[PDB]
Point group: D2
Chain length 458, copies 4
């Protein structure tokens, strides 16, 4: 376990006084497949029941790999898109069927899409992958008998409704509570890590959207097992804020509620908040009452809270991210190394051949001569041969990543739209929290130069 | 020579549209900037009765840099990162303190959507900043004379716009072409080379035709055989294009009689000749080609890129004159960079050995060995930040590099990346290449992921 | 001919120096039915040709009364709506079929619609009625074989495209030019009226979206016939601005072009514009160069230029309106007078009976008595009888107006959304220009009190 | 008594939701306005160090009127027509000249969409205007002390908001209930009457519960038999409702223990009792009724009406205290109105005879007969405008009527028309009517179209 932390922007951990941790999926790890699957089932169920959809949907099978993180839903046309950082359509599907390059240009009349347009759903959530798989299948069925089901737009909204409902019903909560060892992953390192950081004067607080009754259970289940006899998980946290109501917690002005740690009853807050348990709240008041600078607080989450601008504009806290999927992406890039290198040597040669060819052709034209005509014809075949070697090497490279969508962070040779989001929202990111907590709580994180096209390589 | 952001096969390009002022025709920046600088302060202490003392203000080309943003509300000039983060700020000529900055701006990120910020890349951006700075500099000395910070900014803008239409600016440079425009044989040769390869070239300028004729004759003719008319270099010459709107709007074309200058309304498709106004839509269709077969080259990112790239579809390239100095300076700082690279690598090696031990104390619950390691980390870090500081002296002393905002790329760098498929210092750099060249984006991100073998 | 001018807001004609006249449909009258029909044909044609729509559309028949002015198109659901001034749905149709009250609530989940939403098309134009009739029929056909035709949204946009095209092709212009006596109505009064106003020192200018070559023809054809031997229609106008490009002419900054009245060639303008012919332009410069106050200029048009706010915000000219349809509305309200009165006497009685009934019932309940039980039962039947008399009188009142849409200015008992537009954009309005020109060019126009619910009637 | 804009059959209303402060519970406006007035100026010359001289400022209830709008940018107070046209303006306490107005504002129409204008109808609107006026009044006497026009406005707002949460305002009125709140037996009787008819009443206040108990006990109990608790008058009592958001947002409900005040999160539907927060959506569903069966009555048009009427669906009524004076004054001016009506009728008769002759000179191409007619027109017009002027003395001398902006209805009048189905001077006016009454909008538009017989 390398425990690597990737840096997008400088952050001096030495100057960070408080570290705010998201609970579900950040501080406490969940079995992604099992959890996505549950959400899929609960959501698919709520559709056939409270929305009266074809009895056929209950038959839908869930396959984790049918979708990947970072995808965008075009509710208008019932399509799913893989975008580049600037919104360029790398690839698209209508339901499960992949759209061809030709038909793509017919539909979008451009290569770029405007995420500003409300028709597109591009929210990074813990249920995005399930959303995509389900939505895909739903439109596949809607195409069979385009009367038995609502419109593409309507379906997407219904599904979103169920997801929000299932996340409020408590139906999801109760099921994972009754099956904790199947859903939550325990990790000694996390506890050691927190202790490490606290040991150096760091203050750690929890900022979750789950209610306290649920957080008390889960925190106990996942942390206590690694605490010394007598210790209490509560000693690890300065504050524990529940039903935080993020992202609004960061930019809105909802009030704090003091929670009685025993029974759970609450009282309105008057004056500054003091170490303890709370509900709701807002970053503004939290930062003021702790008498510190916003940039002295680091919040770590697992998914981007919709609009990065509105959030980084009215908050000012340092934000970091945990991206669970980095696990397999890295594992896959390593398994593809030899091919990645092969593709590099091949491209090098290709561009070599191409330059020589360009110049020879312009010489024959500039010089009005036919002496290069022989060589030019060979370069042509030769380039046709390497172009073939490469095209095949590429297909080979694809087998190391998700067959339908390729990499989470790459949209062709450039960054995926999700890559941009990560870059804009997170100063640093890692596959999991213990990756960060294994570093020095004094670490000065810097980013390796990104190199501009006019920059000289070294 | 030519930097690639996105692929573009010149073999597929059928038409190359060129911006006239500052793209096809080069100007002596220093000279031009000052002229506009003088004409604006001059127009201020007149059509606005500004304190006669401003006439005393001197122009120092290096007081501002390209890419800066003006905060009219607070009378500040900001250098934002690609994501809108303030990485260097000033109030007039005074650099705002790290602490002072915190009080003025709640967040370090500004919203350029707020019309209060002036974030327009123009050929007079530098002059604008320099002046606006001194104006506010000698505005706090009596906040009862000169209007509000935001008022001043709006006035200065009005002067630049008026002086650009009064003909005040054009008339001066037209009566002293030798002092403002620079001739370059290469430009005409390259154009003829591309035309020899089937390319159709056309001009798309915001300037009037009468002015265009004078400038084009002066700058291109000296490189044209006897009887060879510069107009033969261009398939179409569109004047008073009214960009950016020309690109996404629907204003109509006016046919211009090259002789008397008079104009007639257009009926039917346009044909090779001189026009006024127009819009990219009608042009593309009239030429029966796809937008991706047209390459437009300008010098400034006029307006909102998204509206211009979503509604146009034309390939767009950019000429960025400031590259000359930026490159040279980076070439001088090259040895420092190399040093910073080595230290980062040694830093990575040490921080990894650190986490290994720190992670090795959990797989078996040697407490000082870590300490000496932390110590080394701290030392190489200190060396790194001092190295970056050392590097700052090779660039504009007041605002640093144009493409970098602190360690990150600047907002301007982002704009170039997003707006331009290829960019160069000057137009002849592109025209020097073969008309059938295939530009490929650096596989920098390819070798970038070599960090995978580190594992 | 009463020549009535309706006043929404005070306007002192004495203080008005320049009167700007819209040409097509304001200064020059057109035969509405014939003109709408032409637009319908040309637009329906352009669809089956450049858009490849079912060959069946060519069969579509045009009936002027199938639609009325002021309607709103819900492109999203292929529906046409009659709105109240606050956006309340008075009545709706899906194509030609009328939607029931029940299904209406199903579709809109409210009684109010947000015109702000881009899905609704609510632009008042000279081709709105044709647009509605055509769109209605198109969706009717789209429902037959929902595959042979685009989506409701797509159809509405295609149709709009054709309308704009046909208005630029010049196809419409050439046809009316070759048939002037079938399309344009001549009226001596207009000419006398202009002379009247000019006689009193009023300056009159034309502001049309048509090009000069066409305006010169039409103005000559429709005005000359009433000019004294030797006079020239051009003497009636101070300025004549063509290809004005409204509404943008009012708020944008497009430049003026000087037009050579003989040949038509143009030159860019430098300095102030002087009496003569022009192309393009903008209100700002026009008002400045004439050295007058914007409120000293009155512009009269025939249709509301989309957004009333953006226009009245950046212009400041007094705006008046000519509403051709007032002709039949007034004619119909007069033919309905006796019934309107009958409905009034009946409602009076009804509310009389209802009050007595309300009070008797609350007395029996407040007093816990059964002595009023007899009377209350009679009031019930009696009210049931008058309620029936009225319901029938109403149905009778409907036969005086368009069967599908009722009145242009009324949406039930309240004002129609179109009524609001007229009220917000026009300080005064009349059925036709000569109505205004027949008044004193010194007339001080005032509005009759509108009476607020708390206002005492006199 | 009760004015109807839109139909509402009380037989169909199942629940009546009431605003507490200024709706269910009446306050002595004069007193209350001044208290807030004093607390704000007090908080200004303290948390903002404003010129000690402001403490000298006196409060004159008649210096402002309801419905006015504040132009923070230019430090002005405007009275707009229903369409946003300025029909009366002031800079501080100084009435802006017709000409001066023209220079400041390009158009006579303002865009209330521009966040620069403060157009919020609150129970302290009057105090806000009066103070803000004097502040700018004694701000131009030294534009170096007190911040910018727009700054001042934003500060004053902060004080009003803080003083409303510091508890500063609540504490004062709670310790002197007799001086601020007014008791009214009628209110309790009517409530009980409606409850006797099946109606369910509930409170929806932005105030805290502790404060609510004190105020409700003081104002309702004195009219309740021994052992009859005011809380029995209400099915639900929702506190810290956080309106307007309560109506269109999705904030959660908190169950309040009437005893200790502590709260618990809500699971399942709500039941009769005390709550905090919440949203109209969950409330309506939990009660298993349609929005149109709920009537909410407030005293101020909180926020954007469109967002509140499009996303809510509840029937909304409004209590407008200023009606008392407005009506009385109109009743006094009644004889003038009658006169104006007669002259308008004589004007119409004459202008028609005018056009007839003018139209009769074209049907046969008597030139002075018209002249004498024009003369009469002019005379009756003069009489009309002088009559309207005569009428202005019966209303606020500085701002005229609340519902009229010049001759047109004011922006406030529009808001009432759009937001309220029925409106009254005070709540008991509605409660006085039978619980099964059917309110019908005046058939004024019906008899309005009698102008058709004129033909
Ligand atoms: N500022 C910035 N915006 C980006 C970048 N990559 C993509 N974007 C897009 O730019 C959008 C905002 O548009 P802008 O205000 O820059 O015109 C963002 O919401 C995002 O969708 C980037 O690197 N920098
Ligand atoms: N100001 C105003 N707006 C109205 C009236 N009747 C309808 N409206 C609607 O109000 C809209 C603007 O929303 P507002 O800014 O008033 O919230 C207008 O575009 C129009 O659709 C009216 O009498 N006055
Ligand atoms: Mg989480
Ligand atoms: Mg017209």
């Amino acid at each position: 376990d390398t425990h690597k932390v990737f840096v997008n922007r400088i952050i001096n951990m030495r100057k960070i006084k408080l570290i705010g941790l998201d609970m579900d999926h950040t501080l406490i790890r969940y079995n992604s497949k099992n959890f996505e699957s549950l959400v899929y089932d609960l959501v698919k169920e709520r559709l056939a029941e409270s929305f009266h959809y074809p009895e056929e949907i209950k038959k839908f099978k869930f396959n984790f790999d049918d979708a990947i993180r970072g995808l965008v839903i075009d509710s208008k046309n019932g399509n799913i898109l893989k975008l580049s950082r600037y919104g360029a359509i790398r690839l698209s599907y209508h339901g499960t069927k992949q759209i061809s390059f030709s038909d793509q240009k017919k539909i979008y009349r451009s290569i770029y899409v405007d995420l500003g347009d409300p028709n597109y759903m591009a929210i990074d959530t813990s249920f995005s992958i399930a959303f995509c798989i389900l939505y895909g299948q739903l439109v596949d069925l809607k195409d069979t008998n385009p009367d038995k089901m609502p419109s593409y737009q309507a379906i997407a909204q219904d599904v979103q409704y169920c997801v929000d409902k299932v996340h409020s019903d408590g139906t999801l909560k109760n099921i994972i509570i009754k099956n904790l060892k199947k859903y939550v992953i325990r990790e000694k390192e996390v506890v050691e890590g927190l202790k490490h950081f606290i040991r150096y004067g760091k203050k750690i607080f929890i900022l979750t959207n789950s209610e306290y009754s649920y957080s008390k259970l889960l925190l106990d289940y996942a942390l206590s097992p690694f605490l010394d006899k007598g210790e209490h998980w509560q000693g690890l946290f300065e504050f524990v804020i529940t039903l935080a109501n993020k992202p609004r917690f960061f930019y809105d002005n909802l009030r704090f509620l003091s929670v009685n740690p025993e029974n759970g009853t609450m009282t309105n807050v008057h004056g500054p908040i003091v170490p303890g348990v709370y509900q709701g709240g807002n970053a503004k008041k939290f930062t003021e009452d702790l008498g510190v600078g916003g940039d002295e607080i680091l919040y770590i989450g697992d998914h981007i809270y919709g609009d990065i601008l509105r959030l980084k504009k009215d908050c000012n806290w340092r934000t970091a991210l945990v991206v669970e999927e980095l696990g397999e992406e890295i594992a896959s890039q390593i398994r593809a190394l030899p091919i990645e290198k092969k593709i590099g040597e091949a491209m090098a040669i290709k561009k070599e051949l191409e330059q020589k060819y360009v110049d020879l052709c312009t010489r024959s034209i500039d010089e009005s001569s036919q002496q290069y005509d022989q060589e030019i014809h060979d370069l042509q075949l030769q380039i046709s041969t390497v172009d073939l070697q490469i095209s095949r090497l590429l297909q080979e490279q694809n087998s190391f990543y998700n067959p339908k969508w390729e990499r989470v962070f790459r949209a062709g040779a450039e960054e995926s739209y999700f890559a941009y989001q990560v870059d804009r929202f997170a100063c640093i990111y890692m596959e999991k929290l213990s990756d960060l907590l294994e570093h020095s709580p004094m670490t000065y994180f810097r980013a390796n130069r990104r190199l501009l096209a006019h920059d000289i390589d070294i």
